[PDB]
Write a protein that binds this ligand. Structure first.
Ligand SMILES: O=P(O)(O)OC[C@H]1O[C@](O)(CO)[C@@H](O)[C@@H]1O
Ligand SMILES: O=[P-]([O-])[O-]
Ligand SMILES: [Mg+2]
Ligand SMILES: [Mg+2]
Ligand SMILES: [Mg+2]
Ligand SMILES: [Mg+2]
Length: 328
């Protein structure tokens, strides 16, 4: 009878500081969309929600019916929250400017449904978000979303996995909240989560072996054939960034989506895929790099910009950074 809900938690975060409850309104609103997406996902084949919508998005994806439903849910709850002024979605070419009467201080970048290739085979999928404070007096505009991820004030993801989890990172740390399906509340289950300094799993799509740079190639060989006779790492690659990153957080190790000979900036999208996960990782004591610079320090010039990303346990990410340095 005294459960610790995400709302209560975020409210106390506010109690620790002072002023505005807009962040609590924002996150409460996003939680409502996450529950609606979870319920849809959990019955998607009955509801005939698998399959394509009818267009191609901004960064070349085939749009799925759950992309459209989840995007509409997230956009509508954030508008109604009175906490936001500019929205960037994977699914929309341009930033969305919130109408004057509903604007609040925050800028939200999100991927309303991530892990598209895994929808139809019932593998874990998720929602990713990052939240900035508007940094100016001028009329809110797309340029307000063009901040480096170091300026995030909150970020995280919803994982629609064997259970539904909301992982929320803010200035003082990372906390995990599980959706209780019976009462429709996210309940704190893991407090001040920290990643292991070194793990034993590496996560990458090795079907790109022919295109990898020499540093990634040498690192994967070292995971399979360690020069000190330690046990090889195990491999995992779910193929949904939210699921592979959440495993990396809770078990340690490393996740990689690097640059390659065909993709100089990788595949994943900086604003709403890479920066949120880099922020969660740094607040959990991990690292997130392109191989040459910190993801959170990149100043974007395009809301749909791509970036290479290597994240996870600090000793694992540092080992790969050393190999990039040695090759450089
Ligand atoms: O099939 P690939 O190229 O390994 O891409 C998988 C990546 O694509 C995404 O679905 C993004 O498009 C991520 O969730 C995942 O990490
Ligand atoms: O969010 P999508 O690129 O799987
Ligand atoms: Mg997509
Ligand atoms: Mg999309
Ligand atoms: Mg998506
Ligand atoms: Mg995506």
């Amino acid at each position: 009878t005294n459960i610790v809900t995400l709302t209560r938690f975020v409210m106390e975060e506010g109690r620790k500081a002072r002023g505005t409850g807009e962040m609590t309104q924002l996150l409460n609103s996003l939680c409502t969309a996450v529950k609606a997406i979870s319920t849809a996902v959990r019955k998607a084949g009955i509801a005939h929600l698998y399959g394509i919508a009818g267009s191609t998005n901004v960064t070349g994806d085939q749009v799925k019916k759950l992309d459209v439903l989840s995007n509409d849910l997230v956009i509508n709850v954030l508008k109604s929250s009175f906490a936001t002024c500019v929205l960037v979605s994977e699914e929309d070419k341009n930033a969305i400017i919130v109408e004057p009467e509903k604007r609040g201080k925050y800028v939200v970048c999100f991927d309303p449904l991530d892990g598209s290739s895994n929808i139809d085979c019932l593998v874990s999928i998720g929602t990713i978000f990052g939240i900035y404070r508007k940094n100016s007096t001028d009329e809110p505009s797309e340029k307000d979303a063009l901040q480096p991820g170091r300026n995030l004030v909150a970020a995280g993801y919803a994982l629609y996995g064997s259970a539904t989890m909301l992982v929320l990172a803010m200035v003082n740390g990372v906390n995990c909240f599980m959706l209780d399906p019976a009462i429709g509340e996210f309940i704190l289950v893991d407090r001040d989560v920290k990643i292991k300094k070194k793990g034993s799993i590496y996560s990458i799509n090795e079907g790109y072996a022919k295109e990898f740079d020499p540093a990634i190639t040498e690192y994967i060989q070292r995971k399979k054939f360690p020069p000190d006779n330690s046990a090889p790492y195990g491999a995992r690659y779910v193929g949904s960034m939210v699921a592979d990153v959440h495993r990396t957080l809770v078990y340690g190790g490393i996740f990689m989506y690097p640059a390659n000979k065909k993709s100089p900036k990788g595949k994943l999208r900086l604003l709403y895929e890479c920066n949120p996960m880099a922020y969660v990782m740094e607040k959990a004591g991990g690292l997130a790099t392109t191989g040459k610079e910190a993801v959170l320090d990149i100043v974007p010039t395009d809301i749909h910009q791509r970036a290479p990303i290597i994240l996870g346990s600090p000793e694992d990410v540092t080992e790969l950074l050393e190999i990039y340095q040695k090759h450089a």
